[PDB]
Amino acid sequence: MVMSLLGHYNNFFFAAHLLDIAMGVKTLRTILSSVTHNGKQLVMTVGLLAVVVYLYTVVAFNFFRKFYNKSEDEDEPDMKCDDMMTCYLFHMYVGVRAGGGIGDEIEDPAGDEYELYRVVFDITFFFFVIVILLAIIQGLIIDAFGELRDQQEQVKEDMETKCFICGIGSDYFDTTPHGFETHTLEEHNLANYMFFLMYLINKDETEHTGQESYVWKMYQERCWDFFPAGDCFRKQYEDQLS
Amino acid sequence: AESILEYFRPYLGRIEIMGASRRIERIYFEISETNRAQWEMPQVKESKRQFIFDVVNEGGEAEKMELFVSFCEDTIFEMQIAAQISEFWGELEVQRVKFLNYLSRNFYTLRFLALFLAFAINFILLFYKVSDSPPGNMVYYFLEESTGYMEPALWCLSLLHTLVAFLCIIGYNCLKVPLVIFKREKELARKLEFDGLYITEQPGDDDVKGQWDRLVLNTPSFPSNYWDKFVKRKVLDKHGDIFGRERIAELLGMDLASLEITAHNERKPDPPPGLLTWLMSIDVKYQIWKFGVIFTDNSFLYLGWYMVMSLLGHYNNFFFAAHLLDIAMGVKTLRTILSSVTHNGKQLVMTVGLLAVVVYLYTVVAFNFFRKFYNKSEDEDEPDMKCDDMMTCYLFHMYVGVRAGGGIGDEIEDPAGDEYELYRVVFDITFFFFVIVILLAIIQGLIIDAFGELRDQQEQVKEDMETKCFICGIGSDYFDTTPHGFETHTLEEHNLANYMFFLMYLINKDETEHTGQESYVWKMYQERCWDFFPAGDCFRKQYEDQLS
Ligand SMILES: Nc1ncnc2c1ncn2[C@@H]1O[C@H](COP(=O)(O)OP(=O)(O)CP(=O)(O)O)[C@@H](O)[C@H]1O
Ligand SMILES: Nc1ncnc2c1ncn2[C@@H]1O[C@H](COP(=O)(O)OP(=O)(O)CP(=O)(O)O)[C@@H](O)[C@H]1O
Ligand SMILES: [Mg+2]
Ligand SMILES: [Zn+2]
Ligand SMILES: [Zn+2]
């Protein structure tokens, strides 16, 4: 509402509302949930990247100050790595987005002095920043997506292979034809307990059958011993056919 | 008597053993308040979680009880250390003891303080410039704009960082060095008593530990941290008949073995006066062995390297930059992130080796066939030929083609010439397909497979804990017949901490009072026999005929 009121002032304040409402889409919510799943790992990854770039910038400032000249005109005063802050800003701006390291933007290593050291520097820059630290970011998202798939599969399997009220598996109920469906529709049904609670709440204490009054007394004391919790009607009366 | 039962419920412990019959027997004992308080410490819970993870993941079905007893003994030793650190020549000695106890009590807070000092040092050292002329050949000076504040400060922080590093290395020396000494002594004593590593056989080669453990055997101060001080007599009595008594006695020190027997009673020794005696009372060989054991530990070497770099940082250089990477590994989340990369380092290094072999082969092919295209100059009469030599061509390939991302054809000349056009096109296509596409996908897939591997292992460990008993062989489905039967089984009948407190009570009690069942359990523990565990049975299954 604040942004809607500010939009009356002649500006572009109405542009953000598109991102305000697009999160409401369910499919987009499931897509964004994987990125939101491991935000902490992402921010420590960015911190580790910043530390690595700072260390490489320090090494370049100590040893490779002469190669960070980015000018073509003679008598050039444009030295990028004369200061640590400017060199760090240049590294963070260029080397991360370069995709091939710092050697593509720095001077040629064709000089005899400090050639192998600069080659090793460029190889380590390419290997440690571009290759591994982006693969970690991709693998975090892929691991999140699969983790959400495994959790959904486990939730569905738990529903299909359990009773959620009793402790008896479906293998015992599968002796009779469609025994498990009868158990999960009539003997339990959850909605049955919901409607029983509705009937107990609607009925006044004056009118409360003995069993219903006992259930109300257990509910008032917050005692959950009225649930079967590992037993059913069939197991108690297994001697008889019913 | 409900109030009596509720008052003594935390102090009452139960355990189910099997001994002296073919039936399960219950033993009730007393749990101390301080042991229960020490059990609830987060470090003890983290050690327990690590032990459970190691047992479930890599530990087999067999020998689980031996690892459980070893973990229990380590927990007892940690509790003893925490009890001892808990809080004029004599005044100076008590001040030194108090300072050592204070340093031992606060160890990780000083570590975080060292991290804060390193961050402050890096933040101050951010402002640092170089100039060709001295301020007010090239010189280095900080254009901080705040005169006289940072140059003086970073020196207070340097001295404080050195002092904190020294205090942390002292705290590590007095704190966790004792556990590894106790573990090494216990392992050596058990190997000598039960395995006969030096009595029957010999660890002649492929072990640096077997050769290094020979120095402490002859020292009279062999039992220092281990509880049993009679291991040498037990070994002598065990191997006195098969092997020569004199040889086994001489190999384990034990001078004047005949005089050790109390049948003589010739004279009683007199106490020496404790002046200057401390110089002679030390054992040089034992201290050398202990120093070698300390030098063997990885964390001691890490702290020594940290202190060396801290001392070198006083010399005006940038030696303080690496400390950020030294401490950032201590973060748990960063540790779990880096563990996936550390999980498959070997596959990565053979991948780099295969990449090097492929680049060498392609460089050889280019040198044999495509030497003319590796000219990287614009000025006429160009002597800059990259692939005139095999070493220079290999260096050029390793520098350019790997980081190019599109192959060697983007940097080499144009294939528009009629001669050797299709061969160079095929060369470029194979370079792009074999290096950039597959060999980076392998690197990414290794990390993703490591992450999936760690997720599957954690899921398996948790599922094994939820679906098993970890002591008996009965699943939770049998215990789930009664309401909350599995919770009652896993809290009262087992509980692990119950066995830990039973071991505490057995250790604290002297052999004189051991009740018959407790004496039997002590006798089985002395012989290292683990048949007192149920291992597939419980109280309910034995007495299934009755309701209780
Ligand atoms: N007491 C109970 N115990 C165990 N499962 C129960 C249950 N009550 C319902 N269910 C489970 O619900 C599962 C399927 O129902 P679901 O939750 O998918 O409903 P639904 O939203 O698809 C409506 P509909 O199926 O009529 O289109 C059944 O396999 C059953 O096991
Ligand atoms: N003897 C035993 N056998 C099998 N499982 C046991 C056990 N003793 C404890 N557990 C298992 O440990 C699990 C619970 O302990 P948990 O590891 O959650 O402790 P905790 O560190 O989280 C303290 P809290 O849960 O009270 O905050 C239970 O599932 C239980 O099965
Ligand atoms: Mg799977
Ligand atoms: Zn049911
Ligand atoms: Zn059990």
Coordinates of C-alpha atoms in Angstrom, one line a residue, chain A residues 40-41 44-45 48 51 54-55 58 61-62 65 82-85 88 99-104 109-110 116 118-119 122-123 126-127 131-132 135-136 138-140 142-143 146-147 150 229-230, chain B residues 122 125-130 138 140 317-318 321-322 324-325 328 331 333-334 336-338 340-341 348 352 386 395 398-399 402-403 440 443-444 447-448 451-452 455-456 480-484:
Chain A
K40 CA 23.3 -19.6 3.9
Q41 CA 25.6 -21.9 1.9
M44 CA 29.3 -18.2 2.9
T45 CA 30.3 -19.2 -0.7
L48 CA 34.9 -17.4 0.7
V51 CA 38.5 -13.9 0.9
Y54 CA 41.4 -10.5 -1.5
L55 CA 44.3 -12.9 -1.0
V58 CA 47.4 -9.0 -2.0
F61 CA 50.1 -6.2 -5.3
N62 CA 53.2 -7.7 -3.7
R65 CA 52.2 -4.6 -9.7
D82 CA 48.8 1.1 -7.1
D83 CA 46.5 1.0 -4.0
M84 CA 45.0 -2.0 -2.3
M85 CA 41.5 -0.7 -2.3
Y88 CA 40.6 -5.1 -4.9
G99 CA 35.3 -16.2 -16.9
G100 CA 38.9 -17.0 -17.9
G101 CA 41.0 -15.5 -15.1
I102 CA 43.0 -12.3 -14.7
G103 CA 45.6 -13.1 -17.4
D104 CA 43.2 -12.3 -20.3
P109 CA 53.7 -12.9 -19.8
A110 CA 56.1 -13.0 -22.7
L116 CA 56.4 -19.0 -14.7
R118 CA 52.6 -15.4 -13.5
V119 CA 51.6 -18.5 -15.4
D122 CA 46.8 -17.3 -13.9
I123 CA 46.3 -21.1 -13.8
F126 CA 41.2 -20.0 -13.4
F127 CA 41.1 -23.3 -11.5
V131 CA 35.7 -24.0 -12.0
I132 CA 35.0 -25.1 -8.4
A135 CA 30.1 -26.0 -9.5
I136 CA 29.4 -25.7 -5.7
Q138 CA 25.1 -25.4 -9.0
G139 CA 25.4 -28.5 -6.9
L140 CA 23.7 -26.8 -3.9
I142 CA 20.6 -29.6 -7.6
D143 CA 20.9 -31.2 -4.1
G146 CA 16.5 -33.8 -5.2
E147 CA 16.2 -33.3 -1.4
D150 CA 13.2 -37.4 -1.7
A229 CA -2.3 -46.3 19.6
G230 CA -1.3 -49.8 18.4
Chain B
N122 CA 43.2 -6.9 7.8
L125 CA 46.0 -3.1 6.5
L126 CA 43.5 -2.4 3.7
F127 CA 44.7 1.2 3.6
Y128 CA 48.2 0.7 2.2
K129 CA 49.8 2.5 -0.7
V130 CA 53.1 2.6 -2.6
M138 CA 59.9 2.8 -4.2
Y140 CA 55.4 1.8 1.0
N317 CA 55.3 -7.8 5.4
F318 CA 51.9 -9.1 4.5
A321 CA 46.8 -12.2 5.2
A322 CA 46.9 -16.0 5.4
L324 CA 42.0 -15.4 7.4
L325 CA 42.2 -18.7 5.5
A328 CA 37.8 -19.6 8.2
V331 CA 33.4 -22.4 10.6
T333 CA 29.1 -24.5 7.5
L334 CA 32.2 -23.7 5.5
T336 CA 30.7 -28.9 5.3
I337 CA 30.9 -27.0 2.0
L338 CA 34.7 -27.7 1.7
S340 CA 32.5 -32.1 -0.7
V341 CA 35.6 -30.8 -2.6
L348 CA 40.3 -34.3 -9.4
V352 CA 44.1 -32.9 -14.1
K386 CA 55.1 -20.1 -30.4
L395 CA 53.5 -24.0 -22.3
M398 CA 48.5 -25.0 -21.2
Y399 CA 48.3 -21.3 -20.8
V402 CA 42.5 -24.5 -21.2
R403 CA 41.4 -21.0 -20.2
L440 CA 34.6 -30.0 -16.8
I443 CA 34.5 -32.2 -12.3
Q444 CA 31.1 -30.8 -11.6
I447 CA 31.1 -32.6 -6.5
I448 CA 27.4 -33.2 -7.0
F451 CA 26.9 -34.0 -2.0
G452 CA 24.3 -36.7 -2.9
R455 CA 22.9 -36.7 2.0
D456 CA 22.3 -40.4 1.5
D480 CA 5.1 -51.0 19.2
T481 CA 2.5 -53.5 20.4
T482 CA 2.1 -51.7 23.7
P483 CA 1.4 -48.0 23.7
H484 CA 4.8 -46.1 23.6

